[PDB]
Amino acid sequence: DPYTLVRQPHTILRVVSWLFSIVVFGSIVNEGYLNSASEGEEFCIYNRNPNACSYGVAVGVLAFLTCLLYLALDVYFPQISSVKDRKKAVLSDIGVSAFWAFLWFVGFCYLANQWQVSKPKDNPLNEGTDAARAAIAFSFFSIFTWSLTAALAVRRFKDLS
Template identity: 70%
Template sequence: MDGFQAYGAGKTGGAFDPLTFIRQPQTVVRILCWLFSIVVLGCVANEGYLNRPDEVEEFCIFNRNQNACSYAVAMGTLCFLCSTGFLALDIYFPQISGVKDRKKAVMADIAVSAFWSLLWFVGFCFLANQWQVSKEEDNPLQEGVTAARAAIVFSFFSVFTWALQCLLAIHRFKLGADSVTFNQDYIDPTQQEAPQEALPTEEWMDGA
């Protein structure tokens, strides 16, 4: 069963090849999701909060809405951790021997990717709306403007990267459904032994 494949990976026991792993489409997209989450998190956490001389507390650059900044920071942090976890799972995936366990991992990838794509869409709409209605007098020096716009842009990009990751996971799921079988070259040993076992009977009948 040298051609055995289950959900996009071969039999367990093979050596890990970093170059092959990096070149996989799902790995490339996963790394992009990871990087985009870092950009959004870094932009909002570092430059998303402003303060004025006449105010004690800092306020969010997105229309003074603390929920907008909190949402972006939470999204960036959780998405970073989630992407890291699934990257580790992708590395370990070929070592999963159970077909059912592989199926569960791919189904989890589909569900999580679709969920994150939806959350990033909501986040993009939320940040873009709050940025549009922000008042110029709240930020006369235009501090953090570039970072705020970058957070919005990469939130938009994250919608498509996670959606693409979901489609790749669906493709792996369809491959798994078709490939968890014996290949055409495989011959059942019992079928090879059956004619040999019948030979003594035929010789006995000829002798009779």
């Protein structure tokens, strides 16, 4: 039912992941790994630490960009007179949302794995620093919210189809 998807938690998930993407990006910046990644020095640009974080930055800042724009679309979702055109909008966004699950999975793994390289792998990821752990945690949290949208790729689509 098109007229129930107007209150679909999907929109909420966009807001949640929108914020989470800010937290991850910001946390990485707070650590200073973004600056290190941009640093052309061969001991920083080839350093795996900031490079792993730069993957978090990639998906972080672009998720902010994408989700922000996606939320703007939701504003006018119920303003669409054609249910078919609504399906087009959902299909277009939700396909990327499913891809975000992949993208954040990869970025997350870079953060988690690189931590196990630089720090004792016998210890859990929660033995890292405040912001570093925030980036990892909220990256994982993002994956959850994106995996929900991956399911909605069928739910919402068929409810409009």
